[PDB]
Symmetry: C3
Subunit: 333 residues, 3 copies
């Protein structure tokens, strides 16, 4: 059966961008092939130079967004180069069995494996490393991403009418627990393992030191702000593999929101803020109506502005005074 | 096109009360004018005289609930008198563009401004101050409220049938982060500015020292309990501009609940407890069936009974023994 | 009216198991009688021998799951033996009035009472102890459980079609706040009262020391794993009377989920992870498709693997290669 299906090799693109794909499946079920290389590396996560030992899928935090269609077969070739120090694996929340595939993909440095699973359920799911015994350590070190299993007929609204996005962005939110000394100074380590004991202790506090989008504070701001234009329909895939988050686009709304990211369910309309539970990936659909800067944040303002969970959207177009206008600009009474 | 619309000036009421308004709109779209004066002031939040420098809209925490209908234009005159010391502005989650209006309403002490926006989406929304650089500080200082945008044809239940409320109450939940000294005693400051450095440190722990309704522990209890009678349909608007909450009516339920506050979505039925994400406003509809005292709480019992998130409802009427009764045991058949 | 109704006595079972019941009602309304004895006792919650004074309903944490049909009358005889030292009561989120029954059920050691209430709304609900003044303390000491009110015609899917489970398990999640000394060593006390002052100080941190399923770390692991077979439809009722949780079945999903547990609402399909707000009980329906070990966890992985919120499912049956297969077993590059 499988021996007969057409295969397609996909070339991944780094977040917040997504690889080429069709919203509406143009062919029948296929075997979509992906290859990802694990990479342990030092990452500066804020302006003050705080450094950590990140464990990543394909060199990024989060790992790249993988897109397939319902009933396609995902075949992932996972490589763990001998330059790494730890054993890793991969568990897909979209798969059924073997701990999401984690029990069949344990690879030590210098090893690789190829797993195949059927994407039987449509929606955006989280995937993360989950080694027996150090699950939370690998996930909170950035070893997680997301996979989108689109319905063969694309997205539909609350009434079943097709929804087509012009742009799609992937925002992976990551909660970090960086160890500190007595004074409050962040620790630095030579290798990941050296950091383990202090890491566990920091994690148990349940209070992150950093909460960031795309691997670093301000990673999606300035020259890296997400772009769009008035009239464009944008889909924002947001994931959090360990902690709850409440996404909010300041100045806009979530026209169609699948807070828990599962497409067979009708979307919630006109959301100002929605809650995505830890270990879940959700999606929001919006059409820009006003130009200018928008802030995409975690609506716990402390977590957004103090801890780093804030990004930007730079939108181009003409201002609509009907929707909003300054009747009297600020001036002395 | 707008000059042909009727303009009406509304006087805001202090929470938990709401100004008069029609659930089913009797007129076509209008320009509803509101005026709010910013007031920075000391506020006693608990029985132990703990005092803070509250930053308020119209002198209260939360600010008053504004009610308009879908497609009406909201025209707000925001005044910042010279007696204040900080720059403030206003961001509406109901508005489209310019950071919710925040970018267009920055007013220094002694300034004022008038903003207008079209309420294009029905539901209850959060509005809060959001100054560049000190967003979480103004919000956790009580500078937030809500605005309800009623569908022109009123509320509808899961099956499109009319839902009419006899009473409406606005409950604004506020998380405070008061700084303490080495022992745990709450600090007092002369001006808001003086508190700033300590406030930031307190916020970063992500652990509130108080969580209150209507700005103080027990603000909604005793002589201030919310009232109703058996048979009355009551709508309870609940907002939390920065932190998750999970409302619950002890001894009752939320017959029709819009946990994320957007009316185009069908309500959730028979809710015991619902989650309202931080940065969101929600609404619950319930018909009282039993007289007595009811406790309205944030169902993280520690937050309700230790930190302050608990209020009362005093309902009058006749007891229904078929619903509940203390059993008398003189029988075997 | 009640006098002429059929009465059926039911002997409760210890969690994760549930007493015998019918999904679809074969009779009209009934008076279902239950008896619960309150037991204050020492409990060891972790592998390190940590001990606490648990306050239980029927000797377990959580209390047994009670199951009735919509419109049945629940008659509960609550006994507080003279061996206990504290006053207790019970509050059902399923009942209407008198604070869910708490106002009618206060019993000191040596007293008992019988409460009757109509189960007017279908769904799974939380019930817990709530003595005026020490609510959080009693709930966090393990005094909570859940009651399931089935629609008279059983469960239905999104399209109104019948849903029949073959097995039902009850998982009560508990957040514990064990007091610690200067070094971080857990305290031990002679009686519940001795622990009060410290317990309050530990609760106010809002940070659990333990978060466990069925009363202790590993209560649902090893020889205690929940069991099923490929092809069986399982319903997992999950409750959390005080804090938010986000269940997830690693290697599986929630085919039909009632996150907030109220059956008049349609279930959410294909959930990977769902949020159950504190003070709520939810239910997930799943049909096992692959054999092997599955981990049922709270998807805040730190909470699951460090604090204790993790359990197992051992499923029997034949492996399905179409759903998942290891194309190339881990091997040296
Ligand atoms: Cu790993
Ligand atoms: Cu997972
Ligand atoms: Cu302000
Ligand atoms: Cu906001
Ligand atoms: Cu008790
Ligand atoms: Cu309760």
């Amino acid at each position: 059966d499988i021996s007969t299906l057409p295969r397609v090799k996909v070339d991944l693109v780094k977040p917040p961008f997504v690889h080429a794909h069709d919203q509406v499946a143009k062919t029948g079920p296929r075997v979509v092939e992906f290859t990802m290389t694990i990479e342990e590396k030092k990452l500066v996560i804020d302006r003050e130079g705080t450094e950590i030992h990140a464990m990543t899928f394909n060199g990024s935090v989060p790992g790249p967004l993988m897109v397939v269609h319902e009933n396609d077969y995902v075949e992932l070739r996972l490589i763990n180069p001998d330059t790494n120090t730890l054993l890793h694996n991969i568990d897909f929340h979209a798969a059924t069995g073997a701990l999401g595939g984690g029990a069949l993909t344990q690879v030590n440095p210098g090893e690789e494996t190829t797993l195949r699973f059927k994407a039987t359920k449509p929606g955006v799911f989280v995937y993360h490393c989950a080694p027996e015994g150090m699950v939370p350590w690998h996930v909170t070190s950035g070893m997680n991403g997301a996979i989108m299993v689109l319905p063969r007929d694309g997205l539909k609204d609350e009434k079943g009418q097709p929804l087509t996005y012009d742009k799609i962005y992937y925002v992976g939110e990551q909660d970090f627990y960086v160890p500190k000394d007595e004074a409050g100074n962040y620790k630095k380590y030579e290798t990941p393992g050296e950091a383990y004991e202090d890491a566990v202790k920091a994690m148990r506090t349940l209070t992150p030191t950093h909460i960031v989008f795309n691997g670093a504070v301000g990673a999606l701001t300035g020259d890296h702000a997400l772009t769009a234009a008035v009239g464009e329909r944008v889909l924002v895939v947001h994931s959090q593999a360990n902690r709850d988050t409440r996404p909010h686009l300041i100045g806009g709304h979530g026209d169609y929101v699948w807070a828990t990211g599962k497409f067979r369910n009708p979307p919630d309309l006109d959301q100002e803020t929605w809650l995505i539970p830890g270990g879940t990936a959700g999606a929001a659909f919006y059409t820009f109506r006003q130009p200018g800067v928008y802030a995409y944040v975690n609506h716990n303002l402390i977590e957004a502005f103090e801890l780093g969970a804030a990004g930007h959207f730079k939108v181009t177009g003409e201002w609509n005074d009907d929707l909003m206008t300054s009747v009297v600009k600020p001036a002395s009474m």
